Swiss-Prot record, chain B:
Keyword field contains Cell division: no
Name of the protein in its database record: Major structural protein ORF14
Keyword check for Flavoprotein: no
Chain coiled-coil ranges: 232-245
A Pfam family it matches: Phage_capsid_3
UniProt keyword terms in alphabetical order: Coiled coil
Length: 52, 319, 126, 55, 163, 126
């Protein structure tokens, strides 16, 4: 076992240093159609009552 | 310093939380962070000329022609890598016997909410664009993905009754002026539908189960991927449920494929072959291509764990 | 008298330890012209030995396309070296492997040498 | 479909089919709210477990 | 100086190339040039007249009438050269019972993607025009060919529901 | 598919006129991969000419590692050319020689062609 085929992709190259992404990007993007219904006026579909 | 790149995503919380007076520690939430590593790959091609007297005899300008040819070969290798990584082992896909607008809609809202072909609950796919529009007085957000169909699939979609209905509607309305005339597919549900071609030996297109395993596999990095399901193996998988070849398209959202490094190419012109008579023109590239597919950093099972981040497969019988 | 010839040539050399199993020895590119495949057994195979070696391809079920080699302890002269009688143009990327079975020997080694030409061609005038 | 055809003749609810939306039906806007999953809010469905809803 | 003409096309490169550290000489690509040779052909027609007495008798201006009819003939015969060479020995074709827009769409798809009627592989036929057009924000390349049907196929197409 | 292969090869031809003695024919460097050794008899060996040649190394006592030709006139056709069955890797600078004895002939000559690869390797990925 001296000169056999090594199936070692470039991930097994000890000259490469990995670089980690500069920012962790967020996997959350969705907005829902409820912030616009909600309100204080009596006409709103979801009415907020101010209660001290 | 085009080292292997590691981008990371922050999963979002799905925990029950804690009720009225129970303590936080009774149900902590996990801050699951996921990562991928994109290793580069080196590939290139060369052209050796004839003797100088023979090139000016046959009136072939070898440097010009070889640079042009190698530029084209290089662009096609790049895109074939992007598409091969984009189309192996779909974790999420829909199979239909003939492409139609119903299946494109199914895919678009499967991506909008997060669902799988078995009507499961995966994760919402981030779109290429997402805007706040106003229906009457309610602010909704509408998404725009990119649907890359195979040309057999675009030909199936053109002969679809509801697609003709929708083109009639657009005509009465007047927005996609010049798509049905120009043979294009236009926008369906805010999402541009594109005939992306057919994969052949000369240029890139959406693959099909007619391609050979080795011919498809020589375009995967094999350090950037975990498993490998070629279109032929994917056809065998879908066959376990008759002898029809399949055709593959993709709904893609933002960052479905990640390119690390420098997609620029290098040209090596050696005018010193055979003491200066002959000539060599080489073109080389080092590029990391990977389908966006993040793995759990520590150990945790998560909807994002071994799943295509922004790719739904769209499989139809190529006929 | 024009022709197209192969000007580039490689020799791959690989050792394996004559245990049981298969060994991924030589990596052939597509379109490569294999002009020599030779196996040399370095060692003293004891008498009463069943060790059998077969050099071929991995993609084929039986791994004996190129060479077979049995009875390593019978006339140590025509079993020490064995060259393949077959040439081969690689239609695709290939893996020349060697499969060994019934191995009942110690410190016996195999050196495989594969001389093959690359798929490149140049035009020659004579 | 035929109501969208009528709207297009009249030219009133512009964009609510090129954008995938649903628009207004009888003065009242129709809205795709989404599907209720373990991640964000949508309209519920019978697939939800009783306990998960009652929470 | 209308000699036999020889135009040439540069074929598109294929072939694996080299990967990793393998040097270029392990897989040289072939810059392949294809040529055609077009040889000219002479053809013509002629009209002879009757005796001068008969031409003036029947008040036939022979030079004028003969010239314009021979012009029409020459036009038709050059066009028939073109059509015969165009229709000889189809290497790639589609058959159908009746001409419908399904088959025309299939033919445009086949031409743009280098497919044959049996889905075998070919090269992408170059179009009369090609353009970059934006769909949403994706730039697509649309192609215009030319479809030449006879009268019967044009009828079969007009009797098509999809048409 | 990575591997390491020899890319440089030399053919070395030498001729010797079949007198008695040894002849320093081929020079091998350390690490050379002898992939072919062949000996061709140019001439018409006399009937009952019991001359005998053997090709091997000079540092070994019996110079018959590669080839041995006896009875050069019985099956002349199969005796014109003989190829060695062995492949060799030179661990030091070697000298391939031919020892020819019992030489009782005239005009008979030998041509030894030795094809060997050089010690250099390059890394090839397929």
């Amino acid at each position: 076992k001296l000169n056999n085929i090594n199936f070692n992709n470039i991930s097994n190259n000890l000259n490469l240093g990995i670089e980690v992404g500069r920012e962790i990007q967020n996997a959350s993007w969705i907005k829902s159609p409820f912030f616009s219904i909600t309100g204080t006026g009596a006409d709103r579909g979801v009415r907020l009552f101010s209660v001290a | 310093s085009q080292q292997p790149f590691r981008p990371r995503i922050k999963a979002q919380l799905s925990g029950s939380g804690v009720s009225g007076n129970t303590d936080f520690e009774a149900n902590y939430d996990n801050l699951e962070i996921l990562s991928q590593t994109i290793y580069p790959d080196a590939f290139g091609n060369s052209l050796r000329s004839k003797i100088k007297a023979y090139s000016e005899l046959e009136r072939i300008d070898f440097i010009k022609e070889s640079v042009d040819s190698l530029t084209t070969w290089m662009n096609e290798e790049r895109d074939k890598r992007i598409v091969a990584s984009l189309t192996n082992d779909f974790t999420n896909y829909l199979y239909t016997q003939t492409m139609n607008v119903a299946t494109i809609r199914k895919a678009i809202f499967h991506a909008r909410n997060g669902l799988k072909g078995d009507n499961s609950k995966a994760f919402p796919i981030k779109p290429i664009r997402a805007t706040m529009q106003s229906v009457g007085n309610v602010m909704v957000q509408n998404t725009s993905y990119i649907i890359l169909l195979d040309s057999y699939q675009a030909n199936q979609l053109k002969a679809d009754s509801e697609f003709k209905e929708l083109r009639k509607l657009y005509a009465f309305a007047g927005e996609d002026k010049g798509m049905l005339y120009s043979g294009l597919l236009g926008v369906i549900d805010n999402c541009p539908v594109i005939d992306a071609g057919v994969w052949n030996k000369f240029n890139v297109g959406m693959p099909n189960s007619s391609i050979s395993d080795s011919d498809f596999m020589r375009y995967l990095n094999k350090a950037n991927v975990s498993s490998i399901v070629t279109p032929r193996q994917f056809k065998e998988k879908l066959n376990q449920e008759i002898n029809k070849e399949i055709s593959i398209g993709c709904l893609i959202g933002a960052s479905a494929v990640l390119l690390a490094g420098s997609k620029e190419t290098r040209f090596y012109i050696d005018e010193t072959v055979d003491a200066g008579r002959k000539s060599l023109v080489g073109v080389d590239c080092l590029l990391g291509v990977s389908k966006a597919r993040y793995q759990s950093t520590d150990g945790v099972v998560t909807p994002y764990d071994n799943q295509d981040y922004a790719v739904i497969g769209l499989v139809s019988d190529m006929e | 008298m024009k022709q197209k010839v192969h000007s580039v040539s490689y020799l791959a050399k690989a050792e394996f330890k004559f245990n049981n199993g298969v060994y991924n020895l030589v990596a052939l590119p597509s379109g490569a012209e294999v002009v020599k495949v030779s196996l040399e057994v370095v060692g003293n195979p004891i008498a009463t030995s069943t060790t059998s070696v077969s050099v071929g391809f991995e993609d084929e079920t039986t791994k004996n396309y190129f060479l077979t080699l049995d009875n390593l302890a019978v006339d140590d002269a025509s079993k020490k070296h064995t060259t393949s009688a077959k040439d081969y143009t690689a239609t695709s990327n290939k893996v020349v492997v060697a499969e060994v079975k019934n191995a009942n020997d110690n410190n016996v080694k195999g050196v495989l040498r594969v001389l093959y030409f690359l798929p490149s061609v140049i035009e020659v005038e004579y």
